[PDB]
Design a protein around this nucleic acid. Structure first.
Lengths: 191, 67, 235, 41, 93
RNA sequence: UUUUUUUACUUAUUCAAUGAAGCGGGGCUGGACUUGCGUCCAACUUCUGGAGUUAAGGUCC
């Protein structure tokens, strides 16, 4: 793992217009089921370019121009505030608050559905992958589309070694000893 | 002098003027470092009766402690 | 004639176009903590409600009356070190030739200073005019002074500058200065200054000294309440 | 205009009671970074 | 709209017609002005009447300049109401 | 004057972001509705895996 998967920080260009970036690499991230996309943007304030790391939606490719901002088009890979999208649009890496660089719908094959808009108080009702309903500020950004790599859990692991390889790069506890297989000093289920 | 008036005023800690001064100074000291040097005593009558003098070699340090 | 090889290359500073030019960003500067603290201290004192005994110090002498008071008081600056040394040499000479020091030295007339000394003069009703600096920190050192002067019937004025009063008394700062008595050629000027202080400062602050200070709203909050009131009036 | 007349009268009153030094220079800062000034060593 | 009349007294010697016109024209333009003078001598009686073209301009000038300490004189600057403005006040102005 | 309720505010306190870079309020321009001129809403880059940086220039000296 090199860099965290975040949006750009919310700046003037994304607040008032759009900025174009180019997808240079689509890379594998260890411990994550979803591929990442490296996108290069211009810095509006200096000559040097800025490289960002997004969670890649399905259909994104190297050499593609994506657009991030209020006036960006409704196209897969583009990053828009939720106030700029119609109802029924599915998005990924949705910010809980504007500027948190994305929190919801991040794992492979998952997305967040924009259910409704309340423009009077500037709120947006969304549906999460767990089925929960949520209200977020309408200026929260999301990337149009579905996170790539879906159907990963359909394949059986079939082998203790494949489970071991999955969890060794993830730090999760493996193998797992049952509590009832333990002595009473170790677990409340012990004995 | 003025220090007799300062002592009688410092007795009245629940009056409007003293509560205002205490509130604003509490905010300022909370923004400053936990231990920092004071340029002068903020309670000159109290410092003088405790033995402070306006003489080279006397310093004041302000400190906050968790209660 | 201008050179035909000269060309104009205008830059477009819209979003996604050419690099933004270097602008004045002083409103958004990350300041050191001491600068941020002193600015925030001034702002907080404006935002909170200030009790009248502190808020009365915002009302000071105007430029003309402060200049006339300083014009009188600059004739009564205390003795410098060189002047005192010369006076002591003359008095030592008089003592050597068998004369009292009062034979060669006259009664002095100076601006009276030092807070304890001036408070004593006010309580003994010797002070004829009291000038108090507006920026004494801690404020408790002078916060009772207008009430004391009002009880003793002494003309006072709040004036801007403890450093300015220090220039009168050869110090860096002075919290308060007083005049008890002047010379005969300046008695008329002092009486005119006292009448001017009474009619142009004390009568004008007689009602405003009893009011609460502060409670001023910030800029964005003020605009928010103006918009809210306009929307409520429209709807 | 009446607003202009009132503004002129206010400006003359401000000059009479406070003087004419109403304005102050401030540095233009093209960066948001404050650096410690270099002093004599 | 309506003119404003200011009575100014305690005039120091030297604060006469041209000085008053020039000084109070800074506040606002002056319609009429007369310094009260002795006919036997020509000497000033330390009072004058200034009619400004505009009323709260006159009011601002009076509240600014009242009790001002000028050459040993504490000036008297007052607004006289239009009811008590004399019809012949600015005869000879 | 005080006791409860809710109902606003921000200045204490709390959270987050940034290289503390474009916040708030006006002006200019265009579009709409309105009233017969006040609102709100927009300025700026979308065929292409290029390049964009050392201000060009105008005008007074």
């Amino acid at each position: 793992r090199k860099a965290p998967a975040k949006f750009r920080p919310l700046d003037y260009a994304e607040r008032h217009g759009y900025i174009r970036g180019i997808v240079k690499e689509i890379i594998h991230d260890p411990g994550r089921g979803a591929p990442l996309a490296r996108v290069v943007f211009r810095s509006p304030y200096k000559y040097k370019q800025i490289t960002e790391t997004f969670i890649a939606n399905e259909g994104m490719y190297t050499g593609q121009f994506i657009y991030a901002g209020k006036n960006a088009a409704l196209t897969v890979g583009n990053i828009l505030p939720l106030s700029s999208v119609p109802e029924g649009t599915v998005v990924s890496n949705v910010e809980e608050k504007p500027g948190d660089r994305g929190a919801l719908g991040r794992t492979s094959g998952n997305y967040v559905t924009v259910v409704g808009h309340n423009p009077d108080e500037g709120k947006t009702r969304i549906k999460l992958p767990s089925g929960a309903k949520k209200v977020v500020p309408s200026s929260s950004r999301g990337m149009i589309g579905i996170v790539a790599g879906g159907g990963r859990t359909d394949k059986p692991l079939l082998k203790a070694s494949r489970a071991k390889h999955k969890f060794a790069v993830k730090r999760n506890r493996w193998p797992k000893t049952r509590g009832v297989a333990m002595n009473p000093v170790d677990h409340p289920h012990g004995g | 002098g003025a220090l007799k008036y300062l002592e009688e005023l410092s007795k009245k800690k629940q009056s409007d003027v003293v509560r205002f001064l205490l509130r604003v100074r509490c905010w300022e000291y909370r923004q400053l470092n936990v231990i920092h040097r004071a340029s002068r005593p903020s309670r000159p009558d109290k410092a003088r009766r405790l033995g402070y003098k306006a003489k080279q070699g006397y310093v004041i340090y302000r400190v906050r402690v968790r209660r | 004639p201008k050179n035909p090889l000269l060309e104009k290359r205008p830059r477009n500073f819209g979003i996604g176009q050419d690099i933004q030019p270097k602008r004045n960003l002083s409103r958004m500067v990350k300041w050191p903590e001491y600068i941020r603290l002193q600015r925030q201290k001034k702002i907080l004192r404006m935002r909170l409600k200030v009790p009248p005994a502190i808020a009365q110090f915002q009302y000071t002498l105007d430029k003309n009356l402060a200049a006339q008071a300083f014009k009188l008081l600059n004739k009564y600056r205390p003795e410098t070190k060189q002047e005192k040394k010369e006076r002591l040499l003359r008095e030592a000479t008089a003592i050597k030739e068998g004369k009292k020091k009062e034979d060669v030295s006259k009664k002095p007339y100076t601006v009276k200073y030092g807070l304890n000394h001036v408070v004593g003069l006010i309580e003994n009703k010797k002070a004829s005019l009291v000038l108090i600096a507006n920026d004494v920190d801690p404020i408790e050192l002078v916060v009772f002074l207008p009430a004391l002067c009002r009880k003793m019937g002494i003309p006072y004025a709040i004036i801007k500058g403890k450093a300015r009063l220090g220039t009168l008394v050869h110090k860096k700062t002075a919290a308060v200065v007083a005049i008890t008595e002047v010379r005969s050629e300046d008695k008329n000027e002092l009486a005119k200054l006292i009448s001017a202080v009474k009619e142009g400062y004390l009568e004008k602050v007689e009602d405003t000294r009893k009011r609460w200070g502060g409670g001023i709203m910030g800029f964005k909050a003020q605009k928010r309440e103006e918009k809210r009131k306009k929307s409520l009036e429209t709807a | 205009s009446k607003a202009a007349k009132g503004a002129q009268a206010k400006k003359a009153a401000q000059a009479a009671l406070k003087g004419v030094h109403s304005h102050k220079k401030t540095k233009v800062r093209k960066s948001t970074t404050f650096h410690r000034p270099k002093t004599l060593v | 709209s309506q003119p404003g009349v200011m009575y100014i007294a305690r005039l120091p010697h030297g604060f006469y017609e041209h000085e008053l016109r020039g000084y109070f024209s800074q506040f606002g333009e002056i319609t009429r002005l007369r310094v009260v003078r002795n006919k036997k001598t020509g000497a000033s009686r330390h009072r004058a009447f200034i009619e400004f073209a505009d009323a709260e301009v006159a009011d601002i000038a009076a509240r600014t300049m009242d009790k001002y300490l000028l050459f040993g004189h504490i000036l008297t600057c007052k607004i006289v109401p239009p009811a008590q403005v004399h019809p012949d006040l600015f005869k000879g102005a």
